[PDB]
């Protein structure tokens, strides 16, 4: 995606990685609070991006 | 309405701490001290005493 190209050209990709990991953790917490096992598509996409 | 060891110790410790904090003047208890004295109630009671005394005076 374009976010990666920007956060590479403008330096600091680590900020993108940290924000994406926070989003992954939040999504997993929401996935635990209601009983569901299969991760959604956006979680797979964030994992692949990281 | 029930009294257990925890309640008793908490009550005693609260009383002690309140007294000590009052010694160091670290507490302002104007609300409590004026709800207990209640100067309005003082005036009411004084006027009631005066009326009762007048009643006893005039019955003779």
């Amino acid at each position: 995606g374009d976010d990666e190209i920007e956060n590479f050209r403008n330096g600091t990709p680590d900020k993108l990685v940290s924000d994406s990991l926070l989003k992954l953790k939040r999504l997993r917490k929401e996935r635990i609070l209601n009983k569901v096992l299969k991760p959604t598509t956006e979680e797979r996409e964030l994992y692949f991006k990281v | 309405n029930n009294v257990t060891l925890k309640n008793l110790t908490a009550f005693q410790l609260l009383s002690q701490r309140e007294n000590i904090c009052e010694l160091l003047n670290l507490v302002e208890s104007t609300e409590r001290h004026n709800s207990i004295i209640n100067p309005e109630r003082q005036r009411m009671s004084l006027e009631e005493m005066k009326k009762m005394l007048d009643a006893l005076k005039n019955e003779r």
Partner: protein
């Protein structure tokens, strides 16, 4: 800050709290593992 930092009143639940002893009048504390929802989730 400048004046007396306590200001005791005639409530005994704010009075007890302002002097530290707040949970010390309840039987047992409040925890998270006591609800059936968290139990079902675990």
């Amino acid at each position: 800050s400048e004046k007396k930092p306590i200001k005791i009143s005639a409530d005994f639940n704010a009075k007890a709290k302002s002097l530290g002893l707040e949970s010390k009048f309840s039987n047992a504390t409040k925890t998270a593992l006591g609800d059936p929802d968290t139990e079902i989730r675990i």
